[PDB]
Amino acid sequence: SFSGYLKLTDNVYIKNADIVEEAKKVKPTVVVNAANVYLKHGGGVAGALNKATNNAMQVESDDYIATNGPLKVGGSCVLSGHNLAKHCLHVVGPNVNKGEDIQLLKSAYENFNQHEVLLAPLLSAGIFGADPIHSLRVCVDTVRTNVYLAVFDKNLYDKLVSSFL
Ligand SMILES: O=C(O)[C@@H]1CCC[C@@H]1c1ccc2ocnc2c1
């Protein structure tokens, strides 16, 4: 099971960890991907998770988009977790660097409530351009299921813990 996490609330936990290495160790039921609407897993968490699957995540994702079309910003889909997890929940938070509505971040986190326990990154943070302190706040005030947050950047992790209300 999950180990070394700091408890933030009744149901939100956090750790300074690479989510790929955490997923390989834990093999959780659900790993969350910080996806875009096209499921094009180029960089950030998505590029790292896809590379760890030897591109099998991207091949599966291209078939999903060919059948269903793009996701909505704020939406999600459940696909295989490949060698990392049973399932991957691909969730699209708004990308501030592409000019998307930050109010859609709450809708993005609501997708987590469909799963009893998840390993996840902070949505819309990193290369998606939103303030990670805000993302953590929306996570705590939205998700009611058990979420284990993996924060890869050590300096960000320390800032998120020290500023957490
Ligand atoms: O936690 C971070 O440092 C940022 C915040 C938004 C997500 C990003 C991240 C998370 C896990 C990652 O695992 C490999 N690369 C990763 C990047």
Domain residue ranges of the chain, discontinuous segments joined by + = 6-161
Tokens matching residue 85: 């997890």
Beta-bridge mates of residue 147: 12, 118
Both tokens assigned to 100: 């998307």
Are the C-beta atoms of residues 124 and 135 closer than 8 Å to each other?
Answer: yes
CB atoms within 10 A of CB 63: 12
- CATH code that applies to domain 6-161: 3.40.220.10
The DSSP call for residue 96 is: G
Ligand 1 mean position, distance from CA 160 (Å): 13
CA atoms within 13 Å, Cβ hemisphere of 70: 9
**What atom of ligand 1 comes closest to residue 34's alpha carbon?**
7
Rg of the Cα atoms in the chain: 14
Resolution of this PDB entry, in A?
A: 1.2
Residue 18 Cβ contacting ligand 1 at under 6 Å: yes
Give the residue among 123, 122, 139 at the shortest CA–CA distance from 16.
Answer: 122
Q: Is the CB of 65 inside a 6 Å radius of any atom of ligand 1?
A: no
125 CA distance to ligand 1 middle (Å): 8
Cα separation, 138 vs 94, whole angstroms: 13
Assigned token pair, 29:
């039921």
76 contacts 89 by C-beta, under 8 angstroms: yes
Experimental technique behind these coordinates: X-ray
Contact (Cβ atoms closer than 8 angstroms) between residue 115 and residue 89: yes
Count of CA atoms in the C-beta half-sphere (13 A) of 139: 30
Distance 126 CA to ligand 1 centre (A): 7
CA distance 24 to 18: 10
Residue 158 and residue 71: Cα distance in Å, rounded? 33
Dihedral angle sign, alpha carbons of residues 6, 91, 132, 139: negative
**Which residues, 6 or more positions from 62, have their beta carbon under 8 angstroms from its beta carbon?**
39
Q: Which ligand 1 atom is at minimum distance from the Cα of 124?
A: 6
Nearest-atom number in ligand 1 for the CA of 18 is 13
- CB distance 20 to ligand 1 below 6 Å: yes
Q: How does strand 87-91 pair with strand 76-80?
A: antiparallel
